[PDB]
């Protein structure tokens, strides 16, 4: 992994390459890990390392395209090969939101977007930040305020990245340029939701906000790439319900070193919700915990 600050000016118009497979709603500040295998995708990352290292992740509202998106800057890069197949593994960070003005495809299939860097309106109400933080600590109890930013803009986006909310709520924010309007909406969310459920049947409450816990600095939520490139945004909770486990724990590619993983699925509709993580040593304090996939849950 080679560790590696492109900041386009507000209202500037850029032409940024779009990773197509990626189907996510990236939040500025949130990290996005990727594993690429398509010759064209590796070509793109190799070109991106040589210029400004940023690409665009479109925020699709389906009906496909998308009207907005967020820029991502590669900061970690490692190339290797298996089966003579050359794979690129990168870690990128979200940096700036944008309005999509034109989406076009290259012969290689890599999409290019002409976008407008959107401005970041800020404001005040430290009182709003203090309230959100308090509600957050009650939700997790492992939160370190001193691990939370002070900038209204940055704090809004940390909250926006680590809140168990559906994409449609993730898209509503980000679309707000006013930090204050962002923070307010986050409060309205935190104050109007306590339980999470399976999206495919919506007949099973899986966990509650009081079960959400942070196992690391990125907070209660985080993105991980599985051995095939499938990216998962995992909400870690201590307890969960209405889940069936599939088989015996496995340790291959455990995203949490020390813990084994068994797939978990909805008791009613059998749709994947995440994985149960169980310690392999008596020393680890958590011993048991759940990693639910944000894509499979929905707020009450």
């Amino acid at each position: 992994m080679e560790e590696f600050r492109t900041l386009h000016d507000d209202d500037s118009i850029q032409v940024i390459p779009v990773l197509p497979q990626v189907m996510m709603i990236l939040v500025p500040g949130q990290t996005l890990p990727l594993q690429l295998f398509h010759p064209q995708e590796v070509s793109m990352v190799r070109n991106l390392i040589q210029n400004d290292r940023t690409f665009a992740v479109l925020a699709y509202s389906n009906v496909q395209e998308a009207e907005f998106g967020t820029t991502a800057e590669i900061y970690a890069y490692r190339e290797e090969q298996d089966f003579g197949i050359e794979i690129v593994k990168v870690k990128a960070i979200g940096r700036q939101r944008f309005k999509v003005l034109e989406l076009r495809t290259q012969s290689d299939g890599i999409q290019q977007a002409k976008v407008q860097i959107l401005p970041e309106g800020s404001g005040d109400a430290e009182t709003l930040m203090d309230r959100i933080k308090k509600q957050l600590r009650e939700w997790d109890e492992n939160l370190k305020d001193d691990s939370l930013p002070s900038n209204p803009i940055d704090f809004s986006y940390w909250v926006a990245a680590n809140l168990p909310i559906d994409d449609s709520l993730r898209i509503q924010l980000l679309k707000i340029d006013s930090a204050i309007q962002r923070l307010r909406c986050e409060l309205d969310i935190m104050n109007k939701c306590t339980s999470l459920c399976c999206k495919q049947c919506q007949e099973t409450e899986i966990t509650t906000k009081n079960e959400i816990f942070s196992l690391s600095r990125e907070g209660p939520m985080a993105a991980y790439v599985n051995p095939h490139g499938y990216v998962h945004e995992i909400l870690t909770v201590y307890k969960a319900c209405n889940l069936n486990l599939i088989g015996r724990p496995s340790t291959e590619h455990s995203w949490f070193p020390g813990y084994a993983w068994t797939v978990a699925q909805c008791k009613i509709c059998a749709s994947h919700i995440g994985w149960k993580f169980t310690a392999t040593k008596k020393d680890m304090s958590p011993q048991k915990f759940w990693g639910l996939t944000r894509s499979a849950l929905i707020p009450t």
């Binding site: 095939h228 599939i246 088989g247 059998a270 749709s271 994947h272």
Partner: peptide, 27 residues
């Protein structure tokens, strides 16, 4: 081992895997 690429769910029977993947696709 009839493993799923998306989540790692492993199965004894292929048909069990096949109906598991179709729960991810068309999700």
């Amino acid at each position: 081992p009839f493993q799923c690429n998306q989540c790692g769910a492993s199965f004894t029977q292929k048909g069990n895997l096949l109906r598991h993947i179709k729960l991810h696709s068309g999700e």
